[PDB]
Design an enzyme around this catalytic site. Structure first.
Site, short mmCIF file in Angstrom:
data_model
loop_
_atom_site.label_atom_id
_atom_site.label_comp_id
_atom_site.label_asym_id
_atom_site.label_seq_id
_atom_site.Cartn_x
_atom_site.Cartn_y
_atom_site.Cartn_z
N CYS A 1 -9.23 -20.73 2.79
CA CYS A 1 -9.30 -20.71 4.24
C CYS A 1 -9.18 -22.15 4.75
CB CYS A 1 -10.63 -20.17 4.75
SG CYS A 1 -10.76 -20.21 6.54
N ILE B 1 4.07 17.83 3.25
CA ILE B 1 4.81 18.53 2.18
C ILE B 1 3.75 19.10 1.30
CG2 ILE B 1 6.11 18.23 -0.02
CD1 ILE B 1 7.84 16.34 1.83
N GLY B 2 2.82 18.32 0.76
CA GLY B 2 1.91 19.12 -0.19
C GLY B 2 0.67 19.79 0.43
N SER C 1 -0.61 13.19 5.25
CA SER C 1 -1.81 12.83 4.45
C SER C 1 -2.35 14.07 3.70
CB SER C 1 -2.90 12.34 5.37
OG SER C 1 -4.06 11.92 4.70
N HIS D 1 -7.47 1.56 8.01
CA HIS D 1 -7.71 0.80 6.83
C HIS D 1 -7.21 -0.66 6.92
CE1 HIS D 1 -7.84 4.94 4.63
NE2 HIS D 1 -9.05 4.61 5.04
N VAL E 1 -1.33 0.92 5.71
CA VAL E 1 -1.45 -0.54 5.86
C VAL E 1 -0.09 -1.25 5.99
CG1 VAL E 1 -3.76 -0.58 4.76
CG2 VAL E 1 -1.70 -0.91 3.42
#
Ligand code: 9X8
Ligand code: ZN
Length: 272
Positions: free
Chosen positions: A178, A245-246, A219, A131, A115
């Site tokens: 708004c 990496i993981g 991710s 998202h 995001v």
């Protein structure tokens, strides 16, 4: 800092990722929060370092935001404070290189879970923000979309004592309504428990149908919202590669996995 430590990058993995990318003409790319740790934005699930592994951060539930005025105040007061630094992050060499790949006609489409607007700042045009994006604000009443940067000014005029995390500390904090209808504003991001619009999802799957490979960058794919697109690749019989990496939830589906900082590897992948 925010980049999880990683053993030294393995050259043979790098070679296999090159060969993967060379075999592709129409690469479908998925990114998550790992592609922005090098920009100073923390990720959620890196072992020992992500927001959920290492800190007391809890995401806000959508239904609590929609049902509780006080929850909205707490959310917005924190977002207000954090906006000047959050909004100032820059894309890193990983975002820049994916935009090169698009210029060269080799990246067919990119979907991000992030995001942070960094892929946009970098100039990725063939992009879906799965998202949403914290730089946009939407009214829950009339669906009008505005810029977050414009809301800041309005926060300042409404809460001038904040320019001098609980309900008590937030008492003097009022949230702008708004300006078209007086309804409730929300960052145009998918909060926990809200789901991504089914037509949007369906349009992303449509872009997949023409791809010839998938690359996932940064991710854990623990969230189903992202993992579903790796499942979909497998149903399409697309080769899958991961630069992360993981461990990921899709490691069992991948032909090639590179456990390495994405800003160290991507600049080496050639399109010629
Ligand atoms: C609805 C929302 S906004 O949900 C958010 C997010 O979109 C969603 C999915 O998260 P994610 O997969 O984007 O993030 P995370 O689960 O934290 O995984 C990031 C991965 O990136 C890896 N990583 C870290 N820095 C690097 C690096 N520089 N190079 C390569 N690998 C790296 C980590 O090892 C980790 O596996 O879950 C959250 O509640
Ligand atoms: Zn409205």
């Amino acid at each position: 800092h925010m980049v999880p430590a990683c053993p030294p990058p393995n050259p043979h993995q790098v070679e296999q990722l090159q060969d993967f990318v060379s075999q592709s003409q129409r690469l479908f790319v998925m990114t998550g929060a790992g592609i922005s740790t090098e920009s100073g934005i923390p990720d959620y699930r890196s072992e020992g370092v992500g927001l959920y592994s290492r800190t007391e951060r809890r995401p806000i539930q959508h239904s609590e935001f929609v049902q509780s005025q006080a929850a909205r105040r707490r959310y917005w007061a924190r977002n207000f404070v954090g906006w000047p630094s959050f909004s100032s992050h820059e894309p890193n060499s990983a975002h820049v290189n994916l935009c090169k790949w698009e210029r060269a006609g080799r990246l067919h489409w990119l979907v991000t879970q992030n995001v942070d607007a960094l892929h946009t700042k970098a100039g990725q045009c063939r992009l879906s923000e799965l998202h949403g994006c914290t730089h946009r604000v939407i009214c829950l009443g009339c669906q009008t979309v505005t810029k977050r940067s414009e809301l800041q000014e309005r926060f300042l005029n409404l809460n001038p004592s904040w320019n001098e995390l609980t309900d008590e500390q937030v008492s003097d904090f009022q949230v702008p309504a708004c300006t078209k209808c007086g309804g409730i504003l929300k960052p145009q991001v998918t909060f926990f428990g809200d789901t991504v619009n089914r037509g949007f999802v369906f349009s992303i799957y449509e872009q997949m149908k023409q791809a010839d490979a998938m690359l996932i960058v940064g991710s854990s794919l623990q969230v189903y919202s992202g993992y579903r697109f790796a499942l979909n690749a497998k149903e399409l019989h697309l080769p899958i590669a991961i630069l992360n990496i993981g461990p990921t939830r899709a490691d069992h589906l991948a032909k090639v996995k590179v456990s390495a900082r994405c800003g160290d590897v991507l600049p080496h992948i050639l399109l010629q």
